[PDB]
Structure formats: C-alpha cells, structure tokens
Symmetry: D2
Subunit: 193 residues, 4 copies
C-alpha cells in the first residue's frame, strides 16, 4: 500500500489517580520503554515532593528513575535540549499555575510530554491543575488502586490522622503528627469536619 | 475459592473528546449493553443541544436513543426512580454549575452515572465542568477522532466560518453564518484572533 | 526534539469474542475511521456467512459496510490493488487453512489487516484458525457481550435448539430447526451430550 | 438503584507477547494488587524456566514474586487450597498438553486464573497451547516491547547466535553457544535457514 506511516511528534499523556494507584510505576515503565527506543528522556519532579527521595522519582513498587527537582514550572525550560524527545513530570499537582502553559508549549514544540499527578486531594476535591491537564491532553490514563477497607477498586486517597479520618480543613503539613494515606473507593472514603 | 464477587454499585464514567470522536456512539453502546443486562437506564441531554434532535440522543454514525431533554442539572432528580440502575448524560459540557454535585450525589446513591461531553471548546480551552467531572470520576475514556487535514489522530474541534478558522472570540451562535466543525490534531488546529 | 515520527506500515489486528460481543460493530468503526483518514479500505467476508446479507458486512446494531464475498482465502489476492491501505475481513473463523498465510503475506507487504471472528464455537472449543491469528497478530481485542441468563459479562455463545441447550455433536446446519444463539458467561454456558 | 453488584468468580486472563514485552512485570502487578485486596494467591512456573531463578518468578525490571516450580501441569492441583482465590502461572508456553484442561477446571471451580506466556517462538510460530488459552480466556492482554533495531513497537522475539539471526531449525538448547534474545517488529524480525 504505502511503505511508511509518518506522524507528527508532540503531544501530552496524563497519568492520574489516588495515592498508590501506580502513577509513578506507570510513569517509570513509559520512560524506560523510551530508553529502549533509543530516545532521550528527562524526568522532573517538584522540590516539595520528598516522600522517598530528594533527587529521584520513586515508586512504592521499589523502582526509581533519576530526576531533576524543580521549584517553579518555568524552570523546566532551562534543562531542555533539542536532543531530547521525552519530558516526564511526576507529582504534577504540586506545580504552580504555569504548568499548563509549560506543557502545551512543550507539546507544540514536538516533545512527548508524560505527566503524572493526583486527580484528587484527600478530601475528594479535584487537585491542582490536573483537571485542566486532563482536559487538554491527547491521552488520559486514570489508574485505580485497591480500597484498603473493602477490597474493590479504589478512586480516593484516605488521609488518616491518629487512625481516624482527617478533617476537611486539616493542614497539609502537621508537624509531629502520625498520619497515613491509603486508597479507598467512594463508599469507604470518609471526610468529616 | 469463594463462589461470588460482591461489589458496591455507584460510580462515575466520563466519556470525552472532540466533536466526532464518538462520544455519543460510545454512550449509546454502553447504554445498550445495559438493556441486555436487563437493567433500567435513562438518558439526559441539555435543551440547548438540538443538532440532530430535540427529543433524542443521536450519534453521527446514525444511531439514536430516547432521551429526556433538561434545562437545569437539578431537574434530573425529578425523573429518577428507585427502579433505575443507570443514568446517562450526553453533552454534559452544556450543563450548569450544579452538574458535579448532581452526579456525585447520584453515584453516592448507588447509580451508575455515564457522562459524555467535550473536553475542550473550539479554542482548545477546557470546556465546562468536564475537567472537574474528569478529576472526580472513577473512569475516564478520552476518545480521538481523525484529523481532517493530515489523517493522524485528532484531539481538537476546529470551528470554521466561511471556510476560514474561526476567531478566538467568535460567539457560539452566529445567526445566518455558514459554519462547520471538524476534528484536528494539535498541529492543524488553528485559533487566530 | 524531532519533528516527525516515522513508523512502518503492515500489521495484523484481531477482533474476537462470542456472537453479539460487537465484532462487526468494532470492525465497522475501525473501517469507517479509515475513510475519514482518506485511506482506501476493502472488506471481505466468507460466502457461507449470509445471516443478515449476501453482499454486505452487517452488525446487529443495524450498521453495515459494503463487502466482497469470497469462498477461498487466496481469492483475496485478486481484489487487492496497490492503492489500498486497509484490508478488513469479517467472520474469519469460516475461512480455509490458507487464511494465516494470506494475512501474514498481506501484513508483510505493508497492508493494515483487520480481522474479526469467533474465538470459540458454541461448544466452547477454539474456533478456526482464530487461535493462530491471535498468536501471530500485533493486536488482539477480545470483546465481551452480556450473559443473557445472569447479566454479567459473557465469553461464550450458547446455541439453543427448541429452547434447550444444543448437544455437543449437533450439526452446524439443522434444516428446519428452530435454533437461536445468545451470549453467556462460562457458568451459564451449557453444553450437554 | 440496587446497593450491590454480585458477580461470579472464576475466569481466565491471558498475558502474552514477545520476550521483554513485560509479561512477568504485568503478572507481578496483577498478583500484588491481589495481596492488597487481602486475597490469597499462588504463582506457578515451569521447572525448565530457570533464566533468572529456580525458585522465583522474576521480571527483567528487577521485581520478583515467590513461586512454586512445577514439571507437569496436573501437579498444580496438589498445591491448591480452598482458601486461595488467585492462581497465576508464568511462562505457560512451557507447560504440557494438560494445561488448557487444568486452567478450565480451575476457572470453572471459581478461581481467578492469570496466565502469562509467549504468543510466538523465535521463528514467529504460535507457541505452545498459548493460542488455545487465548481463544478460551475471558481476557487477553497482548503486550508489545520495543523493536531493538528500529525503535517502533515490537511483536517478535529475535534469537541471535554469534550475533547472526538464528536458523529456523536451531535447537532450543545450544550447549556452549553465545546466544541472545531481543524484541523486534515484523519487518526486522529475521528467520533464515
Ligand atoms: C494496588 C496497590 C498497590 N500498592 C503498591 C504496589 C504497586 O506496584 C505500587 C504502586 O505505587 P506507586 O507507583 O508509587 O503509586 P503512585 O505512583 O500513584 O504515587 P507517587 O506518584 O507519589 O509515587 O503500590 C499499594 O501500596 N496499595 C495498593 O492498593
Ligand atoms: C473518526 C471519525 C468518525 N466520524 C463519524 C463516524 C463515527 O461512527 C461517528 C461518531 O460520531 P458521534 O458519535 O456523534 O461523535 P460525538 O458523539 O463525539 O459528538 P456528540 O456527543 O454531539 O454526538 O462520527 C466522523 O464524522 N469524523 C471522524 O473523524
Ligand atoms: C451487549 C449486547 C449487544 N447486543 C447488540 C448491541 C450491539 O451494538 C450489537 C453488536 O452486534 P454485532 O456487532 O453484530 O456482534 P458480532 O459482530 O460479534 O457478530 P458478527 O461478526 O457476525 O456480526 O449487538 C446484543 O444483541 N446482545 C448483547 O448482549
Ligand atoms: C520495552 C522494553 C523493556 N525492557 C525491560 C523493561 C521492562 O520493565 C522489562 C519487562 O521485562 P519482563 O517483565 O521480564 O518481560 P517478559 O516478562 O515478557 O519475559 P518473562 O515472562 O520470561 O519474565 O523489560 C526490555 O528489556 N526491552 C524492551 O524493549
Ligand atoms: Zn471500599
Ligand atoms: Zn493534523
Ligand atoms: Zn451467566
Ligand atoms: Zn523493527
């Protein structure tokens, strides 16, 4: 018919869902495939995100990838060469208001942009600009973890403090607190005041 | 092991993408499957949406389903029985600010809520509350049409007026205008001023 | 990064599952997308397959596409031009032993070959050479209908004769018989002797 | 509508594709999800399969799961309790002729059976009884690796001996040979005689 199938580079993939749904696991396999395709990739993460590492992007499955920690979205530009093909960003919900513009510029320029972040905070509220990234992206993969109460598929992150469901208005940083995060379905998700 | 697999009803599925990506085609097959499963379904659409029908939900593939046209989101409640299992809503981007609350209430109540709508307007801007519906939904299916210029997969709706790309600020209703809508990829999508 | 993404044409997509799982519905949407991509497509079907049409490929959803009815697999070659990009074949389980070779030759030559057929006969046995097509294909989409007894997803075709489950060894053509076919899950599927 | 969604347990999932497509990576994430769902799982592998481990199921991503090595398919039965919910089998293409019967019996009994194996040998031939498992399974996931020559998605395992493509009739065990296996697309896959 016609030997080759020419297409245009440059698009956005969103990976979203609750904590432990596998966003970074999935970000990491996508970026790995990229290295076997002999393409050049870079991975960004927000400074604030230090749960498992300051330097790296780490999945709770135990796998990691080297990353560039960044404090404003527009700082991504300074790390970008023409040589690179793929830009991956983990924990995008923690990025400033620029992130949509940054990502659209990059996709318009020919970069494959892979973006992973929480769809919702612990309260069930749509998170950062993840909603907007979802709307504008060519691909959206919404992952589900397992509800830690009932076993069926989850779609929420449950914040617990001292073992009780967190309040709606509990600050994101509680200094000496014993807090924990687990996935739940919408029926076990509990947000009281 | 264990004869049966009990799960909890009540969740949200979003179907989104550009015009002609197949949102209503997909909404209609989902609702059909429902009838073979001997479940009861109802389909809502906005009053404003009269492209192919006032009464019905119609796909450009030529298939249709009976629907209830509604002018405010909260009017859905008056049409709901306990007997019904599935609530489908086409063209959700045209619904008022209540729609998220309406949908979350319905899913919390045990209804399977299937929601179809544009992710973006003709300008590439995230559309209504579709972004928020995407964030909060258990499932998101983002469909792609074919770019009518270059043939590769699309993610945008191109508005043309008199054959030229529409302006950014062109009103949604142009009285005697000759306008048309076609899918495009991000590279052929053209929004000038 | 790198403006364009060159790939090689020529591969095989299999669509399989029970009767009424949507194989032809899915074959037809794939072929339609092809026409909007301004590519040329041809659709083959076996002579034996006349349930809804002698001439055409028809889905129980009511949609159809023009087809070329063929009695041996190797007859496909006589209908193929260089101009065409896509070859679709419905009801592949009814094709002779050549079909795998025919399909592999076509994919090696640069054609996109889309193949739809039953994975299993009414007895639950792997059907024709669909198993082999599945093994060798780049893409396999296994569709599920709804179990007409219990409502959960199906994976089997139930043959009924006079309302009772057919026997294992009941001929495919029973002359004046009142027979019917419905999808079932593995638990409701009934094959006695 | 109706509080709960009762379904029947017992079905078959096939994961197939070339070497390095991620079959064990995918088998391992499925089995992990199972542990968070507080279900009991067991993983089998063939004795012959000792590439990374005698005891365990290992993915080239570096992740592993404890397994029970087995020499005949019917030996699976001796390891099965009523307490367990999930049976996973890696490298199924290396299992004897019983495997289909073993798997169908297990799914009919209520077990969730997850089966991973090569769709094709290094020659492009459909592998073991993987074709039959594909036909009869409720779910088929056909994974793709990256072609190590050209970068586009692969569907074949290339066997190389001394750096040259292996012959069609080269034995599976070559005693002191320097052999290697890499994924390729159908165009770079090379099987001479
Ligand atoms: C299904 C499930 C998996 N897991 C484990 C096994 C998975 O391989 C692993 C996936 O974890 P992650 O990949 O780290 O989850 P996440 O990536 O969405 O969060 P982040 O972006 O900050 O890293 O988590 C859980 O801890 N709980 C669960 O319910
Ligand atoms: C791929 C493609 C399909 N089609 C046709 C064939 C598809 O079966 C059909 C799908 O159309 P619809 O299903 O009507 O598209 P849409 O549903 O997203 O919009 P709405 O909600 O308002 O109804 O469109 C196009 O017109 N252009 C295209 O590029
Ligand atoms: C889910 C379901 C759908 N349907 C209807 C609605 C679907 O849109 C339609 C799909 O039918 P088809 O597309 O014709 O099913 P099939 O294509 O697999 O068989 P063939 O290749 O010979 O044509 O069937 C049923 O009849 N029973 C069901 O259980
Ligand atoms: C895409 C790609 C990944 N990889 C790496 C990264 C993946 O995370 C990892 C997946 O490897 P595996 O999961 O081990 O591949 P496989 O599981 O299909 O084979 P087996 O059943 O015997 O274990 O392989 C390659 O080595 N080559 C490739 O082309
Ligand atoms: Zn729960
Ligand atoms: Zn285009
Ligand atoms: Zn059933
Ligand atoms: Zn190749």
């Amino acid at each position: 018919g016609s030997m080759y199938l020419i297409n245009q580079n440059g698009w956005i993939e969103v990976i979203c869902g609750s904590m432990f749904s596998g966003k970074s696991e999935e970000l990491i396999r996508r970026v790995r495939r990229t290295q076997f395709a002999k393409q050049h990739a870079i991975v960004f993460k927000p400074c604030i995100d230090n749960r498992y590492s300051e330097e790296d992007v780490v999945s709770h499955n135990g796998l990691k990838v080297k990353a560039v920690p960044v404090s404003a979205s527009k700082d991504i530009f300074e790390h970008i060469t023409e040589e690179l093909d793929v830009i991956a960003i983990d924990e995008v919900q923690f990025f400033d208001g620029d992130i949509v513009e940054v990502v659209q510029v990059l996709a318009n320029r020919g970069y494959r942009v892979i973006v992973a972040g929480l769809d919702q905070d612990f309260r069930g509220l749509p998170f950062g600009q993840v909603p907007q990234l979802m709307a504008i992206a060519e691909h959206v993969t919404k992952l589900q973890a397992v509800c830690s109460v009932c076993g069926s598929p989850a779609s929420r992150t449950q914040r617990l403090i001292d073992g009780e469901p967190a309040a709606f208005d509990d600050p994101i940083i509680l200094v000496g607190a014993s807090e924990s995060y687990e996935p739940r379905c919408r029926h076990c998700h509990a947000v009281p005041a």
